[PDB]
Write a protein that binds this ligand. Structure first.
Ligand SMILES: CNc1ccccc1S(C)(=O)=O
Ligand SMILES: [Zn+2]
Length: 140
């Protein structure tokens, strides 16, 4: 589990979106596993605007933050998980690290702020759904 709380937006894995998120929907992309909903209270997170390939991610299934190198956002084939079939995913950044289903929503952050959230796992890789291209997150 996990979300980015940036202004009056909640960014979550699309597959973990609640009824409330769908009922307060701003934007969703299945290919990216991202869903954004509206909030009443303002949030404490800032979005990275950058092409950093190093940062730190939270891994709930280790209760640990790990420093990682990660690929630039790409179109990647993802094998089957408890929450999705084998399929392609867009704006997905891969690193060497531990990821299980419940780790989805863990923040990846660089010196510039939040880069993305854990989206995929398996074979000792972790995949992050990038949000740094979503400039509209910063305003309105
Ligand atoms: C939809 N575009 C796309 C697809 C795969 C990964 C990243 C991108 S991009 C060039 O926008 O970073
Ligand atoms: Zn950065």
């Amino acid at each position: 589990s996990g979300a980015i709380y940036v202004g009056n937006y909640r960014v979550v894995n699309r597959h973990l979106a609640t009824h409330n998120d769908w009922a307060n929907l701003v934007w969703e992309d299945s290919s990216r596993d991202l869903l954004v909903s509206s909030t009443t209270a303002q949030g404490c997170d800032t979005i990275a605007r950058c092409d950093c390939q190093t940062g730190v991610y939270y891994c709930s299934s280790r209760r640990k933050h790990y420093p990682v190198s990660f690929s630039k956002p790409s179109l990647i084939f993802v094998e089957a998980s408890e929450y999705y079939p084998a399929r392609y995913q867009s704006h997905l950044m891969l690193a060497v690290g531990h990821s299980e289903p419940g780790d989805c929503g863990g923040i990846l952050r660089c010196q510039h702020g939040v880069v993305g959230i854990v989206s995929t796992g398996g074979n000792g890789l972790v995949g992050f759904a990038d949000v740094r291209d979503l400039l509209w997150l910063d305003e309105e």
